From a paper:
In this study, a PETase-like enzyme (PETase SM14) from Streptomyces sp. SM14 was heterologously produced in Escherichia coli, and its activity was tested on post-consumer plastic substrates using high-performance liquid chromatography for product quantification as well as scanning electron microscopy and atomic force microscopy for substrate surface imaging evaluation. PETase SM14 exhibited high salt tolerance (1.5 M), good heat resistance (Tm 56.26 °C), and optimal activity at pH 9.0, highlighting its potential for PET waste bioremediation. All three enzymes share conserved motifs, including the serine hydrolase sequence Gly-x1-Ser-x2-Gly and the catalytic triad Ser-Asp-His. Due to its thermostability and activity on PCP, PETase SM14 may represent an interesting tool for enzymatic PET waste management.
Furthermore, its X-ray crystal structure was solved at 1.43 Å resolution, revealing conserved features of the PETase family with potential relevance for future engineering applications. The X-ray structure of PETase SM14 (UniProt ID: A0A679PDB4) validated the accuracy of the predicted AlphaFold structure, exhibiting a high structural identity with a root-mean-square deviation (RMSD) of 0.278 Å. Notably, this extends to the loop regions, where the catalytic site is located. For instance, Y88 and F98 in PETase SM14 and PE-H, respectively, are positioned in such a way that the catalytic pocket appears to be more closed. Structural alignment enabled the identification of the corresponding residues of PETase SM14 and PE-H, which have a nearly identical arrangement: Y88, H155, M157, W181, I204 and F98, W170, M172, W195, and I219. In PETase SM14, however, the motif includes a histidine (H155), instead of a tryptophan (W159), which is commonly found in IsPETase and related hydrolases, ,, also in PE-H (W170). IsPETase features a highly polarized surface charge, resulting in an isoelectric point (pI) of 9.41, whereas PETase SM14 and PE-H have a theoretical pI of 6.67 and 6.54, respectively (as determined by the ExPASy, ProtParam tool), and both exhibit a less polarized and more delocalized surface charge.
Numbering used by the authors: 26 to 284
The structure:
Amino acid sequence: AQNPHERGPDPSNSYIEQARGSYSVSQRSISRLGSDGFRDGTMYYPTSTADGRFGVVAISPGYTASESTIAWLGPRLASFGFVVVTINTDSRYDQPRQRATQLHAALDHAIGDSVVGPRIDTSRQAVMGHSMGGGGALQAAEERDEIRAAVPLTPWNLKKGWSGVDAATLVIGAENDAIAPVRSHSIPFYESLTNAERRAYLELRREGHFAPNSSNTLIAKYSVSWLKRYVDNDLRYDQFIDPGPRTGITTGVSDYRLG
């Protein structure tokens, strides 16, 4: 490809829905000191070195703070061609700003790791997170220019104005969310991402706050597509983002916007 960062097969709808993509995944534990709330976690990455370095995606855990809440994302997204760091934390670190701190640390930990560091293109970083972890993803994106993509999942944040984010951002809301209602969290965030390279809002029909903590084909396929497109500049994934899913019972999508 003209594009040096293209990894893996030409995609299809079936492909991006797979539990695992083309790449076999290895994993390596994280053990670190400090008081930021991130003392452990996991790095998932393609074993194969044949294709070049990959971007790195850090994921902030969910509402209840354990890594287990986001663990399914790690090997699944990594298998499409990413280094993926899942953070473990606890309830002392529930502020989005505290979660942002950890995301920067997780990206830096993987970059600086003797095993995984050589597999990362440090110019191509990304963040995701659930709940306040999704709020923290927005904040980390505002703070780190090397973040090329953000995918907040049912994000919670009292801060509503995201003009400071340049990273392409896909906000995934849950229609029936009673913790971070879309009307006061996700959609205001989408509406204020006025400087994001691209912004998208994808609402999960008839789901609530905790949907992102279980394997979710919608979250996975659109996360894969967004990360591919903005972390890898991979135009092969535009076909899934625009026009995107139609809404209704048959797609499980209650709202989809691009801007």
